Every structure is written in structure tokens, then in C-alpha cells.
Amino acid sequence: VTIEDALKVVLRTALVHDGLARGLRESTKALTRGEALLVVLVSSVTEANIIKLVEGLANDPENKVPLIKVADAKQLGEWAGLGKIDREGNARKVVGASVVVVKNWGAETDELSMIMEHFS
Amino acid sequence: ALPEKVIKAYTTVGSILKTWTHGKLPKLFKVIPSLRNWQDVIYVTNPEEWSPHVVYEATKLFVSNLTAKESQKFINLILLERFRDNIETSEDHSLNYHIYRAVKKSLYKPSAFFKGFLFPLVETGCNVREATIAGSVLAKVSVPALHSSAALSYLLRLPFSPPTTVFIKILLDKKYALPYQTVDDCVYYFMRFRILSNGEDATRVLPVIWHKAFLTFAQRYKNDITQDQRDFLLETVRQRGHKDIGPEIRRELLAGASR
Amino acid sequence: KVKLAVLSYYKVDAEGKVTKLRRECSNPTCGAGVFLANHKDRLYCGKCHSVYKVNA
Amino acid sequence: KAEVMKEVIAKSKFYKQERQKAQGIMEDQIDNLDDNFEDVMSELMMTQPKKPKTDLDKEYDIKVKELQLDKRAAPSDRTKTEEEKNAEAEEKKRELEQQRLDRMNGMIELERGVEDLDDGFWENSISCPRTHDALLDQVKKLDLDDHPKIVKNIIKAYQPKLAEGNKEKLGKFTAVLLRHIIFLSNQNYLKNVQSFKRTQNALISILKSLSEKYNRELSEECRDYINEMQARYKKNHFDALSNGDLVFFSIIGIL
RNA sequence: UUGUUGAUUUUGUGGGUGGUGGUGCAU
């Protein structure tokens, strides 16, 4: 189980319990409130100022939140559920998500332990 | 208890709401959603005595400002009760226009509406008149296919009651793109009234509303069920088919292609 | 329409330190993270609609 | 009777003034409460209270996302009986037949008449081609029999629903296609008459579908070709006239 | 897109619907 394939069921499970903050605005609100447990960030954001900020908020001394780096924003939007499902089997009309933050996990899975072990 | 000055102020607010018909609401009433104890503040405004105009604007004010979880309480505790109270006490058992528009406004938030108005109603002795009035609102207002599919799936899991069958008919009449998970559940619903071991639903008498809903499903999703599901539904008609609707339903099922 | 309005509310220093450039609404319904709109004469909340003086 | 009417009018007026007085009292109360908002809000603010989902509610959130993952079905309509379709089809034939008969008698649709017209007359990936050359730009390298395929693909790639303005692009394409049909006829085709026949009729069939939705655009181009050919007849006479002109008058009758 | 909010809307193309409609009739 790769880390990327681990993050697949992660962002899907968190969706089922409405525990995902989707968008730059929602992600930052979660981080400032301390409601964030995990941060997933896109390396390919055109504006570096977004990258500097989520990193800064995630690395705040009072509330240190783990951060994850992902190549493309389009695929995170698919993981955050933004995209729509077609007759064939592939995702379509997917809306790229620059930042996604996990508020509530919902269920305890084995995929947790690897990610938390990886950060530790 | 709220501050006695606050109680007097909101007491005067409520008196305005009794006779309010048009214009600007009292500014104190406007900021109630932004309060943690809006329930306590709302109680002193006497929600039962709100004029129908206040109920319409109150639904606009609170559904937009309150969270989804909080809007469910507002819909469930006030709007649902007012919708029931007006129908029960009215001479013709009709619903006031302003309340009729309020229920549409609450439907702007599907999750809160479904869990606050529809599901509590059908599970709390909904009557045919209530279902007809509520069903009409659901018919006209645009509702998401996803939210409706979840709502239709749940109603297909509840015990049979004609008031619930109406809402099942309305949702089917909407002509949504139901996911096949919902379609399979819909097949299961009509598969539970066939004679086989089976429950009372097998021998339970079926009103026309059940047949019309089953014709409604047949006319549309005949192209979205498997051949086995077609055979199961086809032989359901053979056991529970209606005199006049039944033959028509047979034609629609046979005209469809398996998915 | 305003683009990346959230970006403007807060700033980065070269060391990664994050500072908030707007005051946050004191209302616990708003909780934390609700930033007041800065007008010439007043601070305005978009959620609670409360009005605060700029220098209060 | 008159005294009853006056009492009714007086009673209505007496009721109207009471409503206005009540409305004014309501407005005055609203003004006072608004003035007292800040005092009420502050005391309310100080006394604010300090900071598990239902099993049914949990299921719904599980359902909603699961339904999101699942595929969605296409909706279909009720199948009309063969008699109803024939009755409908027989009806639709009737009005069209009746509409044609009235027009042979002089009914003019804008329903004016021919006589109205005779007043004052005697006293005084895939690229959409907006131009005829642009259609050829995509089709130099394609064979003669390949013209219907590219032309059909252009319509598919620019259907009205796909994007805004596709109606205009196809409407212009309708005019562009018509000139292509004329253009091919002028070109020599004795070598490959059979291949030309496979293209020439196919393009006309496509134009017929386009004309059904773009008769306005087609008619404007049709007039322009009509207008142009007098000017060529105005200088070249028969040398202006070619096979395509004979073809053109044929296509107009079709469409 | 709402009034701050988060996909609930907006836009373009097609498109089904008379229905909190009445009046009588047959337990």
C-alpha cells in the first residue's frame, strides 16, 4: 500500500463523516481554529504565496499539524469528491483542489496507522 | 434566563410578529440566528403565534444564516409544527400561502429539509392531506438528484404507508437520474409486496397510489434495470397487478432494455 | 468578484511566520476564523452582522 | 339601496383607516426597538451560554456519498402506443398540408396576404469553417468521398448544447456547406462520377438537416448566391452559368 | 452562487408537465 493509495481511502472515508475542509478558505479556517488534524497541499500551485501560508499555518508552534505534498491539484479534487462520475467508470468535470484539510476522520482503519507512523 | 431587559425587548418583538404583514422586521429579530441560544430567544417570540408572513421571512432568515445542523432544528421544531397545525385547524384542511412558500425556502437546504420536515413527518403519523400538500412542494421546487436519491432510498426502506407512497411517487415523478443503487432499492421495494416466506406486505392490499408509483418507475427506468430485476418486477404484476394500470405496466417493462 | 480575498487577510514573513492583518469577530457563534470587514468608520461581520468600532 | 352602499363605503373606509393607524403604530414600535438594539444586544451578548449524531442522520451521510460514487441512470419517457403515434403523425401531416394549401392561395407568414405585398410596388480539434475556403482548408488532403465524414464531424463537434454560440457557428456552417455543394458540382467529376454521387447526395442530406434548424442562415446565403449570379450574368451571360447553377436551383426546391 | 456562504446556484442548448382545480356519480 503506497502512501498515495493510502490517501485514497483516507479522503474518501473523511468525506463520509463530513470531516473534510475543501478550499483555501475552509482549510485556513480549520487551521486557525485548531480543528485540523492533517493537511494535504499541492506542490504545483502557481502562486507560491499559497504554499508559504499553509506551510506556515501548519507549522504554527501552538498547533503543529502534519502536512502532505501532492503533485497535482486536479487529483486531490477527485479525492475530495469534487469531480462527477460518468456512465463508463472514469471521473469527469473534476475541479482541482489546491488544499484539503481533515477535520474528523470518522472511522479507524489500518491505513491510518501507516500515515501516522510515517509522520512519527 | 435571558436578561430582563432583553426579555422585555424580545417580548415587544414578538407582539410585532403577531400582526406583521409587510415592511422591515424588527432589527432584534434579524440577529437571532447569530445567537447561540436562538432557541431560547425564539421561544420568547412565541413561534406558534407568528403570523404566516413572519414564518416566510423567518425561514429565509434562519436557513441562510444557521448551520445545516441548526437549520434542521428550526425546520423541525417550528416550520414542521406550523405546517401541521395550520392543516389540522383550517376549515378546508388547506395550507396558508406564506407557509407554503416557507417550506419551499427551507427546501433550499436539502439535508436540513429532508431530516427536519419530510422524514419526521412520514415517521410521525403523516396523513394523506399532509403528504399531498408537502408532495406538491417537492414536485415544483428543483431538488438535487443526489440528495433526492438518498431521500428516496430511505423512504423505500420505511414500512409501507400510503402517505409515504405519495412521496415515493413524487420523487419518482421528478424524473431524476437516480443512481443504480437507488434503482435496485426501488426494485426491492416493489419486490417486497409479492407473494412467496414473506411478510404482510405480500398480502397487503395496495392502493392506486402504489400502482401509479410503480407505473411511474416503469415508464422511465425500464432501461436501467437488469433482466433478472425485470423478471422479478414483471411477476410482481402477475400477483399484485391492478386491473387497468397493471396491463399498462406490463407493456412498459417489456419495452425496456437490460442495462 | 474578488479573487483570492482570503490571501489578503494574512501575511508571511521570510521565516514562515503567519500574521493576521484583520481583526476576528468576537462572537462565539462565529467562533474563531471569522474576520471582520474593515470599513472606513466601522468593522463589520459578514456572519453575525454585528458592528464594531475601528479603535475599540 | 343607496344608504346600504354608503354604509358599505363608509365601513370600508373606517376599516381602511384603522389598518393605516395599526400600520403606523407597528412602524413606530419597530423604530423604538431598533434604537434600543445596542442596549439589548450587549446584555444578550454578556449572558450568552458557553460552548452524537442520530443514527438515521449518520446513515444519510453514508448514503449521500455512496450515491455520489455510484453511476447515474438516464431518464426515459413513456412509450406512446402505435395508434397514438400514428394519430399524432396523421395529425401533424394535416396542419402542414393545410398550411401549404393556404399558402398556394396566398397566405403569407411574417398572416398577411399577397394583396398586401402589391401596394407601392408599381409606383416605385475539429475546426468549424466560417467561410467556404475555410471548409476546404480542412479538406484539401481528404478524398472526394471523405467530404460527408468531415462535414458530419464538424456538426458533431459544434452541437448547440456543447458550448454557447455553437448555434451561430453551425448556422454559418449551413451557408458554408451549401457553397461547397455548389463548388463540387462546378469541379470536373467525369473521372469519378460514382464517388461524386456518393458525396453529392450525402452533403445534400446533411444540408437538409442543417436547413431544418438553420433555414434563416441558409436563406440569406441562398439570396446572396441568387444576387451574385445576375452580376455574373450581367457581365458573362451564359459563361457565368455553369452546372452548379443548375444544381443550385435543384437544391432550393429540395429545401 | 448565497447572505459572510460553500456547489444548495448561474449560464447555453433541448425538454415533460394543466393540478394544496372544481362539480357530480357509484360502500
Coil vs helix vs strand at D7: helix
For residue B30, which of D45, D30, D29 has the smallest C-alpha distance?
D30
List all nucleotides in chain E with at least one atom under 7 A from a protein Cβ. Answer: 2-9, 11-14, 16, 19-21
Q: Return the C-alpha cell found at B87.
A: 392543516
- Where b means 16+ CB within 10 Å and e means fewer, B37-74 reads ebeebbebbebeebbbbbbbbbbebbbebbeeebbbbb
Most A-contacting residue of D59, D65, D67, D162 (CB-CB within 10 A), to test interface: D65
Within 8 A of B36 by CB-CB distance, chain C residues are 28-29
Phi-psi region of A90 (alpha: psi -120 to 50; beta: other; left: phi over 0): beta
- Is residue D118 within 8 Å of D129, Cβ to Cβ? no
Please report, as a single letter, which amino acid is at residue C17: K
CA B69/CA B72 separation, integer angstroms: 5
Q: How far is the CA of D212 from the C1' of E14 (A)?
A: 15
Q: In the Cβ-directed half-sphere of B19, how many Cα atoms lie within 13 Å?
A: 14
Q: How far is the CA of D75 from the C1' of E15 (A)?
A: 12
Q: Return the C-alpha cell found at D182.
A: 455548389
Counting as contact any 3 or more CB pairs under 8 A, the partners of A are C, D
Please report, as a single letter, which amino acid is at residue B22: H
Q: How far is the CA of B12 from the C1' of E1 (A)?
A: 36
- Residue holding cell 430582563? B4
Q: Who contacts A20 (Cβ-Cβ below 8 Å, separation ≥6)? A: A11, A14, A80, A81, A100, A101, A102, A103
DSSP string, C8-34: HHEEE-TT--EEE-SPBP--TTT-SS-
Q: How far is the CA of A87 from the C1' of E7 (A)?
A: 21
- The terminus-to-terminus CA distance of chain D in angstroms comes to 71
Q: How far is the CA of B242 from the C1' of E26 (A)?
A: 19
Coil vs helix vs strand at D84: helix
- C-alpha distance from C7 to closest chain A C-alpha (Å): 7
Q: Per DSSP, what are the bridge partners of residue A38?
A: A102
D48 contact C CB<8A: yes
C26 contact B CB<8A: no
Name the helix (H) or strand (E) containing A101: strand A99-102
Enclosing domain of residue A110: 1-120
- Is residue B65 within 8 Å of D70, Cβ to Cβ? no
Closest residue in B to D64 (Cα) is B150
Comparing CB atoms, the residue among A16, A86, A87 nearest residue D65 is A16
Gyration radius of chain B over CA positions: 22
Contact between D72 and A85 using a beta-carbon 8 Å cutoff: yes
Domain of A53, CATH number, reads: 3.30.1330.30
- Residue holding cell 419530510? B118
Q: Per DSSP, what are the bridge partners of residue A91?
A: A85
Say which DSSP state D73 is in.
Answer: P
Q: In the Cβ-directed half-sphere of A26, how many Cα atoms lie within 13 Å?
A: 15
Number of other CB atoms surrounding residue B101 within 10 Å: 17
Of how many residues is chain C composed? 56
CA B98/CA B20 separation, integer angstroms: 13
A17 contact D CB<8A: yes
Burial class (CB in 10 A: 0-12, 13-18, 19+), A54: buried
D20 contact B CB<8A: no
Contact between C32 and A24 using a beta-carbon 8 Å cutoff: no
Contact between A53 and C17 using a beta-carbon 8 Å cutoff: no
Q: Who contacts B244 (Cβ-Cβ below 8 Å, separation ≥6)? A: none
- Residue holding cell 479573487? C3
Contact between D73 and B35 using a beta-carbon 8 Å cutoff: no
For residue B55, which of B33, B34, B32, B82 has the smallest C-alpha distance?
B82
Within 8 A of B20 by CB-CB distance, chain D residues are 26
Please report, as a single letter, which amino acid is at residue A62: E
Within 8 A of C50 by CB-CB distance, chain B residues are 31, 34
3-state secondary structure chain B: CCCHHHHHHHHHHHHHHHHCCCCCCCHHHHCHHHCCCHHHHHHHCCHHHCCHHHHHHHHHHHHHHCCHHHHHHHHHHHHHHHHHHHHHHCCCCCCCHHHHHHHHHHCCCHHHHHHHHHHHHHCCCCCHHHHHHHHHHHHHCCCCHHHHHHHHHHHCCCCCCHHHHHHHHHHHHCCCCCEHHHHHHHHHHHHCCCCCCCCHHHHCCCCHHHHHHHHHHHHHHHHHCCHHHHHHHHHHHHHHCCCCHHHHHHHHHHCCCCC
User: Nearest residue to nucleotide E4 when comparing alpha carbons to its C1'?
Assistant: C46
Task: For C43, list phi and psi in degrees, rounded to 5.
Answer: -105, 130
For residue B98, which of B118, B116, B79 has the smallest C-alpha distance?
B79
Most D-contacting residue of A16, A104, A105 (CB-CB within 10 A), to test interface: A16
Within 8 A of D61 by CB-CB distance, chain A residues are 16-18
CA B204/CA D149 separation, integer angstroms: 59
- C-alpha distance from C46 to closest chain D C-alpha (Å): 17
Please report, as a single letter, which amino acid is at residue D209: S
CA angle D137, D143, D146 (to 5 degrees): 90
Within 8 A of D72 by CB-CB distance, chain A residues are 85, 87
Q: Who contacts D255 (Cβ-Cβ below 8 Å, separation ≥6)? A: D207, D208, D211, D215, D218
Coil vs helix vs strand at A23: coil
Report the number of distinct structural domains present in chain A.
Answer: 1
For residue B88, which of B127, B123, B134, B115 has the smallest C-alpha distance?
B127
Please report, as a single letter, which amino acid is at residue D59: E
Comparing CB atoms, the residue among A33, A49, A60 nearest residue C12 is A49
- C-alpha distance from A40 to closest chain D C-alpha (Å): 21
- Is residue B22 within 8 Å of B51, Cβ to Cβ? no
Comparing CB atoms, the residue among C6, C12, C17 nearest residue A28 is C6
**B84-93: Cβ within 8 A, 24+ apart:** B84/B121, B84/B130, B85/B48, B86/B52, B87/B129, B87/B130, B87/B133, B93/B129
- Residue holding cell 500551485? A45
Contact between A85 and D65 using a beta-carbon 8 Å cutoff: no
Closest residue in B to D42 (Cα) is B6
Contact between C28 and D51 using a beta-carbon 8 Å cutoff: yes
